[PDB]
Amino acid sequence: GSMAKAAAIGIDLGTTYSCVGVFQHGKVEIIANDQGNRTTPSYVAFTDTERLIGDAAKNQVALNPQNTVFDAKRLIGRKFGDPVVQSDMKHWPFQVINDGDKPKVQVSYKGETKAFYPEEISSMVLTKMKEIAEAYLGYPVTNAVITVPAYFNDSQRQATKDAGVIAGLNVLRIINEPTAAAIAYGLDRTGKGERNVLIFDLGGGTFDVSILTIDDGIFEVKATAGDTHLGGEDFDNRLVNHFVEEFKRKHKKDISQNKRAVRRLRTACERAKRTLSSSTQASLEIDSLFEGIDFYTSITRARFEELCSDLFRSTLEPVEKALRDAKLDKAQIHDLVLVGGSTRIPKVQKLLQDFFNGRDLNKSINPDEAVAYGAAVQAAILIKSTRAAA
Numbered sequence: 001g002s003m004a005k006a007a008a009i010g011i012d013l014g015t016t017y018s019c020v021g022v023f024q025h026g027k028v029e030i031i032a033n034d035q036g037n038r039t040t041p042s043y044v045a046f047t048d049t050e051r052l053i054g055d056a057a058k059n060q061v062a063l064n065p066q067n068t069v070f071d072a073k074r075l076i077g078r079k080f081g082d083p084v085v086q087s088d089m090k091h092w093p094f095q096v097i098n099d100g101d102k103p104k105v106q107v108s109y110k111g112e113t114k115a116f117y118p119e120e121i122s123s124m125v126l127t128k129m130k131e132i133a134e135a136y137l138g139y140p141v142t143n144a145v146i147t148v149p150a151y152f153n154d155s156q157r158q159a160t161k162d163a164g165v166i167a168g169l170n171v172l173r174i175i176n177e178p179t180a181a182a183i184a185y186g187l188d189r190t191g192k193g194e195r196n197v198l199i200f201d202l203g204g205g206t207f208d209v210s211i212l213t214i215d216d217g218i219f220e221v222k223a224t225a226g227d228t229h230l231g232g233e234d235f236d237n238r239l240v241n242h243f244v245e246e247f248k249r250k251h252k253k254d255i256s257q258n259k260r261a262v263r264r265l266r267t268a269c270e271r272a273k274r275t276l277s278s279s280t281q282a283s284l285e286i287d288s289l290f291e292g293i294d295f296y297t298s299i300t301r302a303r304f305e306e307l308c309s310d311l312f313r314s315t316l317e318p319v320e321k322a323l324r325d326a327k328l329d330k331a332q333i334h335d336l337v338l339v340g341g342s343t344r345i346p347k348v349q350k351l352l353q354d355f356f357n358g359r360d361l362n363k364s365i366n367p368d369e370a371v372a373y374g375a376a377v378q379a380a381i382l383i384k385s386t387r388a389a390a
């Protein structure tokens with residue numbers, strides 16, 4: 001009669017990390033990749049012999065910075081002359097070239113100089129997410145919902161669809177990331193009446209606040225605000241500067257000019273930062289950090305909180321701005337939703353909860369997974385083809 005249909009997938013195509021989910025048996029499964037990771041770096045690396053995508057690309061970035069591409073989402077659907085593009089290029093080790101006022105990333109690959117459009121790099125990330133899903137399902141996947149930031153314009157949305165088409169995916173729909181996070185919590189399934197939802201999204205490099213109104217499952221974006229210069233990497237930077245100073249005090253040596261030592265220090269700092277989200281202290285143990293000196297130290301959560309205190313408080317400025325733009329008072333917000341790994345920081349949670357006078361935060365769905373979760377819920381709804389009974 002009719003053959004069983006393959007599951008459709010939900011993909012959060014993120015700036016730094018991507019995530020894939022599938023809705024089956026009345027629930028969402030966030031799919032881990034073959035290294036056991038529930039999120040995959042949005043990285044693509046090129047060598048004389050291979051093209052590596054995800055963890056394999058990110059794990060070799062230190063010695064191949066010119067040919068390892070990341071942050072393609074910051075270039076997608078933008079003109080080469082866009083001031084955002086020109087400023088971002090100063091921070092990237094890879095080359096960005098101008099092809100008819102459209103940016104392309106230029107690398108050494110398989111013995112040649114090759115240039116790729118941002119949508120081509122994103123299609124490579126999407127191919128890896130499709131393969132992760134097919135490894136779990138055990139059959140080929142065709143249909144997907146892909147998410148984008150609410151502020152993405154028509155060109156940025158079309159270039160994201162183009163990336164999906166290059167990857168061999170049928171793009172069911174491009175949906176906003178804050179809408180997908182709300183769908184993950186079933187905030188569109190609460191019946192008749194208006195609900196005001198605030199999505200608090202703190203990423204690796206940027207911070208976004210969105211206010212949505214939901215009425216009978218219909219979403220309206222009421223306000224967006226944020227800080228392009230606020231993310232998890234800024235907290236890592238504060239720990240880096242702290243430990244560089246500590247090494248100077250303790251050993252009378254400045255390590256800041258040995259890239260390897262700084263890199264090993266930053267890697268340890270990011271892991272210590274994660275431990276501090278569940279523990280009140282964390283150890284830092286690096287063997288032969290600089291001049292054969294072992295660096296064995298610790299940091300309390302209180303000291304880390306003091307180091308990043310101004311940065312954490314600054315997340316409340318875009319919240320107040322979004323509320324003024326939406327013409328709403330904080331008491332009028334019905335639901336608060338957390339998105340991004342950096343939202344696990346207890347102090348960030350406490351500051352926002354205190355701002356909303358003790359209100360509970362929706363954080364039960366892993367914040368680095370909530371967007372893919374909602375995209376998977378939507379993908380299953382979009383492929384339904386029920387014929388009404390008499």
Ligand SMILES: Nc1ncnc2c1nc(Br)n2[C@@H]1O[C@H](CO)[C@@H](O)[C@H]1O
Nearest residue numbers: 016203204232233274277341342344
């Ligand atoms: N448990 C956690 N506590 C604090 N931060 C975290 C945690 N987990 C993740 Br993931 N992060 C940070 O989220 C960002 C995602 O791009 C990176 O800066 C990660 O370091």
Ligand SMILES: [Mg+2]
Nearest residue numbers: 014177203371
């Ligand atoms: Mg995100």
